[PDB]
Design a protein around this ligand. Structure first.
Ligand SMILES: [Cl-]
Ligand SMILES: [Cl-]
Ligand code: NA
Length: 129
């Protein structure tokens, strides 16, 4: 599913991501834009052999099982395919675990490089939320 901006903001809010761990909703929308272009089906393989999945590009080395990432773990207890669904529930629940792992949203390098410190409130401007 390719979400619209306000559509994704609304879905993230209904799943409790708005201000989760102190990260306002625009942070999450910004991260999703740069991670996946708002596309739930996005996948990207990394040099280490892991793959990032879904709207928030969650990685198979730690967070989900894809069967082809040696030595990796599955801390969200899900197949990585679950992260590609139209329904963002699984990605949100897993992102809550990731952002709670110690480094906040710096766990998403694209958030650190492209969203952190910027006017992230712009990502939700105009939305009926
Ligand atoms: Cl915001
Ligand atoms: Cl934090
Ligand atoms: Na894994």
């Amino acid at each position: 599913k390719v979400f619209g901006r306000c559509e994704l903001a609304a879905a993230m809010k209904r799943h409790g991501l708005d201000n989760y761990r102190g990260y306002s909703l625009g942070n999450w929308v910004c991260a999703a834009k740069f991670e996946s272009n708002f596309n739930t089906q996005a996948t990207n393989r990394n040099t280490d052999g892991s793959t990032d999945y879904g709207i928030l590009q969650i990685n198979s080395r730690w967070w989900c099982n894809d069967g082809r990432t040696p030595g990796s773990r599955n801390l969200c207890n899900i197949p990585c395919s679950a992260l590609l669904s139209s329904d963002i529930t699984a990605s949100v629940n897993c992102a809550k675990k990731i952002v709670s792992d110690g480094n906040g949203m710096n766990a998403w390098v694209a958030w650190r490089n492209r969203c952190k410190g910027t006017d992230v409130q712009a990502w939700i401007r105009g939305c009926r939320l």
